[PDB]
Design a protein around this nucleic acid. Sequence first.
DNA 1: TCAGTGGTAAGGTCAGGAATGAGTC
DNA 2: GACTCATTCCTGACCTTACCACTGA
Length: 1205
Amino acid sequence: MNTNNIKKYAPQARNDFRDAVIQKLTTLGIAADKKGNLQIAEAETIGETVRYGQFDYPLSTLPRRERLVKRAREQGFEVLVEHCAYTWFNRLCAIRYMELHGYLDHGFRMLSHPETPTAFEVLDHVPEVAEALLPESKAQLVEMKLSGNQDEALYRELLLGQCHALHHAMPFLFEAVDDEAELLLPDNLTRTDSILRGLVDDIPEEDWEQVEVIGWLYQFYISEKKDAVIGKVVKSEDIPAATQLFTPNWIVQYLVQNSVGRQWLQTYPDSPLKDKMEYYIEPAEQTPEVQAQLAAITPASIEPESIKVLDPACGSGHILTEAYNVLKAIYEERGYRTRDIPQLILENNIFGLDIDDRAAQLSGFAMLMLARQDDRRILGRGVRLNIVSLQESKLDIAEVWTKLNFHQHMQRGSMGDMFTQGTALANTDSAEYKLLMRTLALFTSAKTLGSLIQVPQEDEAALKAFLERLYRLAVEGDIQQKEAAAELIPYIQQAWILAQRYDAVVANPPYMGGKGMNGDLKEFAKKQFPDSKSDLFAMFMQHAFSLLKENGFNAQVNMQSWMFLSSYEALRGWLLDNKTFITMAHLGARAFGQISGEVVQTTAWVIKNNHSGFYKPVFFRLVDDNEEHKKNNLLNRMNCFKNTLQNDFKKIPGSPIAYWATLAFINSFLKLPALGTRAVKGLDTNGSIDVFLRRWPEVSINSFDALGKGNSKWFPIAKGGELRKWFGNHEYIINYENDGIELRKNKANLRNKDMYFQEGGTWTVVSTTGFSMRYMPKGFLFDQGGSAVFCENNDELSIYNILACMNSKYINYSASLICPTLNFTTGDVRKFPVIKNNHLEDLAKKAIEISKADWNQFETSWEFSKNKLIEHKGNVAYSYASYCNFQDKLYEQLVNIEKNINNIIEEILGFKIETTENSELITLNSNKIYRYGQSETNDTFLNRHRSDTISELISYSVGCQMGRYSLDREGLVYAHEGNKGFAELAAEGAYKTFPADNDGILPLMDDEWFEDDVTSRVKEFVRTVWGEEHLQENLEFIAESLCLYAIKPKKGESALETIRRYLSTQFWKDHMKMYKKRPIYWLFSSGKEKAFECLVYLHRYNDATLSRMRTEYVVPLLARYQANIDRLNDQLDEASGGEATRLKRERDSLIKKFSELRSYDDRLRHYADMRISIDLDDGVKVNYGKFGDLLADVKAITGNAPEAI
DNA sequence: TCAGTGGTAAGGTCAGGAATGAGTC
DNA sequence: GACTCATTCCTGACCTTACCACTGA
Ligand SMILES: C[S@@+](CC[C@H](N)C(=O)[O-])C[C@H]1O[C@@H](n2cnc3c(N)ncnc32)[C@H](O)[C@@H]1O
Ligand SMILES: [Mg+2]
């Protein structure tokens, strides 16, 4: 990938530059403690030399550092560090870009040397470069070049001279003299460990051929900080870090060509510009009244130097570059000279605002480079750009005015204002000037609000005049006047930019919801934007219309939420009664490459500033694809809708923008009863989801309400889950003992308490695969993600009819139309239509029974009874065939039932509906398509299904060995705590056919040394179940099925060898996958070598388990290893040659196993000395980290690395 | 002002084949 | 001069859960 190099390099470059700046600041006596407090040292001046603690500098540097100290007090230390770091990074990147394109006058490279790695070409042409840059002191430099030493100082002087020369062209990025940042430039630039080496030889020089590279830098420099700050409340200083992305080029072209190009083409329909714009959309045919209305406002002529384009959040300047291209085409069409166009465009067409200085620097550099591509003599003229960063007003009020001395030069310096001094307009009045006071009062919190600040248009022209005077006082004034003007210019310039009215506003606004916005921004939004205070992009969308003149265009790409969510309903009304929709492309998710996830789902629109309710917009539906496919579809004008008036959006209550809905569906939807207040929201813990919720297998069943009797601490809860219909997702339990006293002590939100333990339906709030509802029996609670539906005391609708309706294709389509924003909130579900019928109830009952039968066939459900294979006593292959037939019968029955339901629904409405995503999917584990996903072809999961079935059989056998299950009775047998009551169960005869282990420790060895070896007991289980006569073929079938998918086949081995290899290699991972990182059989392993491994049943563990494990399993194993090692030593001397080679090579393995087992035995003795007791109520996650490194995969389960004694 | 219910998110995890790289033989 | 395993390397698919926000008494 082209962007991989920059993506890897940029954050590391940020870290390196920050470290260098911090070190340089510490050398200057400026530092911050752990808490962040300033630690400015005291400067001691002796022998015309300043000292800051231990370090010393010449006296000449004393004043400059003082300014840095001021910047350390008026702003934070971290702000100063970040600013200096990215300033130097941007300067170096700009120099590199200009040297790779030959834009430097001397024509030699600065940061590198062609065809010579780790060299600088500038040092080979010192006289020429010195004459070009430092004519007054070239000879001395030559002398330095003659010295042979002190090359670092020479290179530093040359680089600083290059920067000072570049100051004139780009005042926004380079300084000229008395620059504080020169003190922070790192030394040892020419060495092999400098910051320049990474920049030079970490990015290929072929990546600098286009301006686009700049944009990538703009995104990749700050990615780590974005990851650090995202997800919580964002401070004002961190606002840019969370909202800085790079917009794809085709989206920008679509936005620009349909706003500026459209304005040009309206006046000049027959112009050679439409052929140069690939993304220009032809308007649909309109009624004669609409055409007559439009023709009455179109001007008869447009002057090219009158089109004003503004980017309220310029960022890297991509939108400005595309606008520049379009305007250059327009100027060339009008017939201007080629080399004069760029200056005109940059001086009277392009305007840009940003809240971050880095973005302003990058945008200015990008615009200048794009102009330089066309004009050779540019960068030598005083081109003044109108792309700025907003500055917060904190300077003094009257001191700057006194320094300015306006009356001395022209007039209005003592009391002359826009009005008389004594008028005292509004509250700001005129302490020095009416206009100046009013302007400065508006930017007291600029670094938080940005471009949302409103400036009256009536003050525009006056401001302009004032600005002009400043432009003359910075060139034709004394020192005080020059510095006062240089201080005042940015505020007046930003005010004038905000006070102007524009033909088009094109932007990609920041996205930030209610959680991320801080208090000041939130209260400002509440006061100023009542209809769009819930998000930042909505505020930008509403504020952009106030910056437009009449008949202007607003073109933006933002979140799709405002199209559908209720929080923006009022906003939509305000849009449908005052504005005109021109065009829209709905992009959905997977747009904006280099961004992952489905939170960001976007739409790009162009809207006019006038009102016409009978206009027909053009819509494109580009939701379901990736970025390249979306671009190709947009280029081919695919998925177009042009048959809906703008007023027609107001027929549906709430006025959603549902452009792709059909008229018949709308008519059916309007005249149909809704679900109503039957749907309610579930409970929610305050911040303790991991304290009160468990998975069912990891607690005792005596305290489980669904299984136990009397006392109940744990209750089943519906929490959502993946797509599943009519039954399932019964996997979570909550602590609700004594009516949730512990929950009430935690200030939990127990919503709708009176509906608990009732039967009803439940759906998943957060989903991206479609809508589904499942039956919920009595004795259940429901979470906020598992919101529920309940029937009234006596209503005409039963719960089964509602379930039948909600799982049909009609409701699926309607839910897709109503809730396309990743959430199915209760208020949106409350308006789903419901249909009353009689057959639907029995059809839903049959579907629920089938789904329950499908769900209860695995160990993961607490209603599991027994393994399905062992019910047939004929043969293992015969049992597998019967199992497959049973699953097929279930699948066919459910298919028929759903088909009948859909037919009944369709014959009532009177029309057929289009199939939607997973509209006909059957959500059963008996269906391989649902279980293993969709492949390119069918009949490709037979081997995987067979392997999974055999693995489940082996897991059931292990569970029978542990005593969890039995062959004499169905369901769970022993799931209590601390091995209490197991002796009574064993004495009663619950394991008569297949006895259980006497202590709950199963050695997972690689030999038949132990009598309770797992492989031998699996063989015994197979013999007991399917008889003795056909044992060998059953074992062969099991081994072949395991080798099909679970493990790789081996050249030569028997069935038992394959079983042992699977048990020692794959069983643990399968168990962890099945129980989802909450195991009930814990694996104790010695290490990378299988010296000793065992399985312990969690429910049979007690404080005497480790001692028994050490005594009965580890010490005899050590004795056996010692005896075996002693045996091999005797045979080595007797044998010789190649005969003894195998003995020698196996003795080393035996020695390694013995040493590892001794270390593990020492650790086990230490941990067994402390009698460790665990409470199952604490959960597997907490209890799994109490044994150090004795357990396997501690980090994957607990989440943190195991500790060492 | 506090109860009692609803709303929303420039994201976060995870299975699952392709590289990548140290032991064997 | 290949084999054989144990780590990354994305890559596409899928659902949070905490903390606001909005009425009634
Ligand atoms: C995603 S960038 C878009 C830049 C440009 N469209 C591009 O693709 O390069 C959004 C920018 O808006 C800026 N921004 C955030 N909040 C702002 C505010 N309140 N006022 C003005 N600009 C703001 C951020 O600094 C950020 O750089
Ligand atoms: Mg045992």
